[PDB]
Write a protein that binds this ligand. Structure first.
Ligand SMILES: Nc1nc2c(ncn2[C@@H]2O[C@H](COP(=O)(O)OP(=O)(O)O)[C@@H](O)[C@H]2O)c(=O)[nH]1
Ligand SMILES: [Mn+2]
Ligand SMILES: [Mn+2]
Ligand SMILES: [Mn+2]
Length: 620
């Protein structure tokens, strides 16, 4: 009911019906409509027509270009200030700070950024009021994971960005069928605005609406709400990805007894007809996608891709660890993707694919550094800065974090069960990062507890995923440092608890290092398709083959255990060297880190593994 005409936004609905919305769905829409004051409200139905008019609108607004060389592929150049995931402006709001991050013994926590409700209410009220003035509010109903799937959760994103709606149509399951499945069930409330209400008081660079100064990505797990403002780029705007699928989901999984992890999922089959499913957690820009879509070099081996970034896992009745990719597409980095590195990626992005900040060729194609592909005579390149670009300038034509957004179904090696609502049984878990020195190519954990300790001890050099720069090695336990939904100590404890479940078929735990270097700065391992040689060893260890040698850090392959045929020139000495001098410093850094950051919430079993490892190393 109302006394005037200031609460019923029906007259602003250009597609859909507020009447057809579930009870709580309508309230969430009209409430923020009244707060944000959008000129129009557009309730997405996921249709091809919608996608069609949507793209055409963005092309008439100078938002995106059409890549005439490919089938239904589009380019989008963003503002140079809004070109990646802002880790420093992401915050989690909990009544108690301890719920979010362990109280550091001395210094600032690196495992999350907490903000009180009082501080957030101020920041919120200073951003969203009237932020969509003169823009359309798109209502994105999307399901994470297959519909009806048990570990499938539904969210509603409100956004004033057509670029976001198009991307979300690729990355999630979006449309009207999601509304009907939801019914009156619960859902995740997602609110996004670029923060440039009209009239534009700030000119737009590359026609990219954004507000860097006021950027803020907030999470409220107690309320099941995600509030993002000022950014339109991937992690910040695609709220169902990082914000939902990891941070909020991790909190839920802790509550509900499953797991939400920053892991690729791949299935692998050997020449004997036996197939196994593995999961790998690497930091961003550390090889997950190239591994999940690997083109193996060992004959009789087949790799299939279930997912490349997010895994939702839970033990089933039979005690197996089951995993699903809750996403619907791939949002991978562009540069370095060549036919020689990730050819399966090339085959996927040639249609229905949206690119961001990659270079455009004068004939209607894409270009980026490392594409490893000569262009024809008379073909010019326009950089992502929208300027004539030549290979003689220092300006790279493709931004380091530039992306492609492609449907998962188009992948030629997509696993025939990536949408199976029952998941895939994970028999192995892989950790790793970019360690230039010290860490051997691969080793196996001595037990679950040691495994959990290995994940927690992961470290890697600074890449181009967040705002980190320089050549520095920092901690990234479980590859989840930027995405922990709650206290990390309680995270570790949650993992260790899996060893207590009845008839729990705990998978093996490996640590790989694709990036060990020599004294000249030369990679000691070709990697990519050759990583199938490392997976071969893992496959045999899962079946119980006496191919492992015991060492102070874990099991490593025996002599002549790794199929190295076709190489011969690989320096195996330095590739597996376990220097005591290096590992005595490694334990010190891990100790100091764990004592400071996890402090009084560090489980004792992790402290015991730390103690045990320090002991085995001193006996060298
Ligand atoms: N040396 C080496 N580099 C790799 C390998 N796989 C990927 N890369 C590089 O890492 C960058 C990002 O890899 P990607 O698979 O997209 O990482 P993701 O973010 O985890 O999906 C690419 O530019 C590649 O050049 C590998 O096996 N060996
Ligand atoms: Mn990721
Ligand atoms: Mn990726
Ligand atoms: Mn225990």
């Amino acid at each position: 009911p109302q006394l005037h005409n200031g609460l019923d936004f029906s007259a602003k609905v250009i597609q859909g019906s507020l009447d057809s919305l579930p009870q709580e769905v309508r309230k969430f829409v009209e409430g923020n409509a009244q707060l944000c004051q959008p000129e129009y409200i557009h309730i997405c139905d996921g249709s091809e027509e919608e996608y069609g008019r949507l793209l055409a609108h963005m092309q008439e607004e100078g938002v995106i270009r059409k890549l005439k060389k490919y089938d239904n592929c589009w380019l989008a150049l963003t503002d140079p200030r809004d070109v990646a995931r802002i880790e420093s402006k992401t915050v989690i709001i909990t009544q108690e700070q301890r719920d979010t991050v362990p109280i550091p013994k001395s210094g600032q926590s690196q495992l999350g950024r907490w903000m009180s409700e009082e501080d957030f209410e101020k920041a919120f009220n200073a951003r969203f009021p009237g932020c969509m003035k003169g823009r359309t509010m798109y209502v994105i109903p999307f399901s994470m994971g297959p519909l009806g799937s048990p570990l499938a959760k539904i969210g509603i994103e409100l956004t004033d960005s057509p670029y976001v709606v198009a991307s979300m149509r690729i990355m999630t399951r979006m449309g009207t069928s999601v509304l009907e499945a939801l019914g009156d069930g619960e859902f995740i409330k997602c609110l996004h605005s670029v923060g440039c209400p009209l009239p534009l008081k700030k000119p737009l660079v590359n026609n990219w609406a954004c507000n860097p100064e006021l950027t803020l990505i907030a999470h409220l797990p107690d309320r099941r709400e995600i509030i993002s403002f000022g950014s339109g780029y991937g992690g910040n705007s695609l709220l169902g990805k990082k914000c939902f699928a990891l941070r909020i989901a991790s909190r839920l999984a802790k509550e509900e007894g499953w797991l939400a992890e920053h892991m690729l999922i791949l299935g692998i089959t050997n020449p004997e007809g036996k197939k196994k499913y593995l999961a790998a957690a690497f930091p961003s820009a550390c090889g997950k996608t190239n591994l999940a879509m690997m083109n193996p070099t060992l004959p009789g081996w087949k790799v299939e891709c279930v997912g490349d970034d997010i895994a939702w896992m839970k033990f089933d009745a039979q005690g197996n660890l089951r995993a699903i990719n809750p996403e619907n597409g791939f949002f991978g980095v562009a540069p370095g993707t060549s036919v020689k590195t990730n050819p399966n990626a090339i085959k996927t992005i040639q249609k229905n694919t949206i690119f961001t900040n990659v270079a455009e060729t004068s004939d209607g194609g894409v270009y980026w550094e490392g594409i490893d592909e000569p262009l024809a005579p008379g073909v010019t390149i326009t950089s992502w800065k929208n300027k004539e670009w030549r290979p003689q300038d220092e300006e790279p034509c493709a931004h380091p974090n530039s992306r492609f957004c492609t449907p998962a179904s188009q992948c030629p090696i997509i696993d025939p069960a990536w949408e199976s609502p029952e998941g895939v049984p994970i028999e192995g878990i892989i950790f790793g990062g970019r360690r230039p020195a010290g860490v051997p190519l691969v080793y196996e954990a001595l037990s679950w507890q040691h495994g959990v300790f290995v994940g927690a001890a992961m470290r890697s050099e600074a890449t181009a995923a967040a705002e980190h720069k320089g050549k520095v090695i920092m901690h990234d336990p479980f590859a989840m440092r930027p995405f922990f939904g709650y206290n990390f100590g309680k995270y570790l404890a949650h993992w260790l608890s899996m060893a207590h479940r009845p008839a729990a078929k705990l998978p093996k735990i490996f640590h790989v290092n694709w990036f060990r270097k020599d004294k000249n700065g030369k990679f000691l391992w070709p990697g990519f398709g050759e990583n199938s040689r490392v997976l071969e060893w893992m496959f045999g260890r899962i079946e119980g083959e006496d191919s492992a040698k015991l060492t102070p850090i874990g099991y490593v392959p025996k002599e002549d255990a790794l199929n190295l045929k076709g190489l011969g020139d690989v320096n195996v000495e330095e590739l597996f060297g376990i220097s005591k001098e290096f590992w005595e410093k490694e334990v010190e850094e891990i100790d100091k880190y764990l004592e400071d950051q996890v402090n009084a919430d560090l489980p004792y079993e992790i402290e015991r593994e730390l103690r045990a490892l320090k002991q085995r190393i001193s006996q060298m």
